[model samples]
Target chain A: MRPIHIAARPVLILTREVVRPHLTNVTVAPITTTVRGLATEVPVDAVNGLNQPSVVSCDNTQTIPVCDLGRQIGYLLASQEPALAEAIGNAFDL
Target chain B: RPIHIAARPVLILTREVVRPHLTNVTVAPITTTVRGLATEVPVDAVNGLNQPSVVSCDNTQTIPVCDLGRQIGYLLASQEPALAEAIGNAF
Candidate 1:
C-alpha cells in the first residue's frame, strides 16, 4: 500500500511594476506594483521598474505553470496517433 | 483503507444527463397555455435540444453544464452532500 500525506498551501505570488507617462510638462515615472497569493515584499525593480528589458525578473519560487498540458495530452491521446507523439506514454505523462 | 480527499464531481458536456432519468415513466401530455394556440406532446418523445429556449451554461470547453450548475450550488450551499457526492454517485 502506498502512504500519502496532504496539506494545502499557497504556492505562488506575482508582482510587477508599472510606469505611466504624464502631461503638464512633468515627466512622471510612477513607481507601483501589484501583489498576489503570498505576503512577500519584492522590489519593483524585480519586474523592471520604469525601464524596458529583454526579460522580467519574476519570483520563480512563487510561480506556477498555468498551462493545461494534461488536457492537451488527453486530446492527442484520444486521437490515438502514437507515432505522431514525441514519445508515447512516458514523454509527457505529467 | 480509503484516502479521504473529499469528493468532487466529474464534468460532463451532454444535456442527456440533465433533467430526471425517467426511462419507464409515462409521458402524459403536459398542456401549457401558449401565445394563443394550445399544444400537447409526450415529453419523453421531445428532445431537449429542440426546445425554443434552452438555458445555456458555459464551461471552459472542458467542464460540463450540469457540472457548472452543481459546482456553483455546491460552492453556495453551506451544507452537506456537496456537488462532489451528488455527481460522483449520480444515478
Candidate 2:
C-alpha cells in the first residue's frame, strides 16, 4: 500500500509483484543491511546508526507483514549495501 | 479499493507494537547460539533500555537470526514468525 523508503532497516519488499507470472497472493523478501561477517554478530548500537549496512542475500525470500502502521513502516537509512541494492534492482528487473 | 503503488514490498520495523514487553527480562552477557545462530539476549532485564537485542528466529522460513535492537526490528517481526517456528521445528 506504500512505497518503501530507502532508509528503512530490515525492510520488506513485494515479492508478489517481483515474482509476477509466478502466481501468489503475497510474497516478499525481508531486507537487512549487510554485515561484516555474520548478521547476527552485528551489535544493536551499530544498527541504530545511519551507517551503511549490507543485507544477507537477495536470493532469499520471506513472508509479508500482516500488519503495518499506515504502511509507513521504516526508512531505508542509507544504501550502503551494494548487494542489497542489486537485489532490489533484480527484484524489479530494473 | 486498494491503492496500487509500484510493485514493491512494504518496508517496516519490528518494534513494541508487535513484540512482547522486553523490559523486566534478564539478558545474558555472553552471546548464545540458538539454532546455530549467535544471538544477544535482552539486556538489563529492563525493556526499551536495551535498544539492540538479538533473538533466534523460528524455522518456518530459511532466514537465520533477527535484530530487535531498533524499533523497526519489532515492526518487521511478522517476518520472523518462521524464526520461532524454525526453532520449534528443530526441537
Candidate 3:
C-alpha cells in the first residue's frame, strides 16, 4: 500500500496486477491514527512519510476508484515490511 | 454529542459465561486504521499483535470459532483501560 491524500490516508492497494497500466480501482486499508490498541492495528510514522503517528486498521479496508487517489506522499520502505506483515497476520490470525 | 459511533471490556459471553456446548464466540475486529476514537483500544506485540493495531469495540460480533480455527493471541482488558472504557461505552 502507498500513502496518499484523501485527507492523508495510507492505503494498501489490493490490486493484484502490477504491470497493467489502466487501473480502474484498488481496494485498500485506510491507515488511521485512531488507535484502539487492537491487535489488527499496524503503526507507521516518519518512515512512511507520516509526520504524526498512525496505524493501518486492516479491518477497515476499503475500495475506491483511481480518481480518488491523490499525490503520493509516502511508500512502504523495505524496513517497514515486517510491520505490515505482522499487522496483516494479526488481522488474519496468521 | 458529536458524531456518534461507539468501548469497555465487554465480557465475551460465549467464552466467559456461555456454556461450552455453545458453538459461538464473541469477537471484535482488529485494524490498523486509527481514528483515535474512544471505542478503539490501542494494542501491539506485547498483547500478541505484531504491530500497533486497535481492537475496535464498536463492531463486535458473535462468531463460531470452528471457522476461526485456532487461538492466535489474547487481549486483556485489564492492561488497556481505554479499551475497557471503550467496551463499556459501546454497550
- Winning model by TM-score: 3
> Measured by TM-score, how close is model 3 to the native structure?
0.44
Worst 10 residues of 1 chain B by lDDT: B22-31
Better of 1 and 3 by lDDT: 3
DockQ measured for candidate 1 = 0.01
DockQ of 2: 0.03
Query: What lDDT is reached at residue B8 by model 2?
Result: 16
lDDT of 2 by residue, B1-91 (tens): 0011122111122342523322111111212233344221222213222343334332112111122122222223453564445445544
lDDT string for model 3 (A36-87, tens) is: 8877787777788777788878788787755455555677676766877787
Q: What is the lDDT of residue B63 in candidate 3?
A: 54
TM-score of each: 0.14, 0.23, 0.44
* Candidate 2 lDDT score at position A62: 51
TM-score of 1: 0.14
Candidate 1 local lDDT, A35-79, one digit each (tens) = 342222222322321232121112232222221001110011223
Residue A43 alpha-carbon offset, candidate 2, angstroms: 17
Q: Candidate 2 vs. truth: CA RMSD? A: 18.2
What's each prediction's clash count? 0, 35, 35
| Better candidate by DockQ, 2 or 3 | 2
Q: Which parts of model 2 have CA positions greater than 4 angstroms off?
A: A1-9, A16-25, A33-56, A65-71, A75-85, A88-94, B1-91
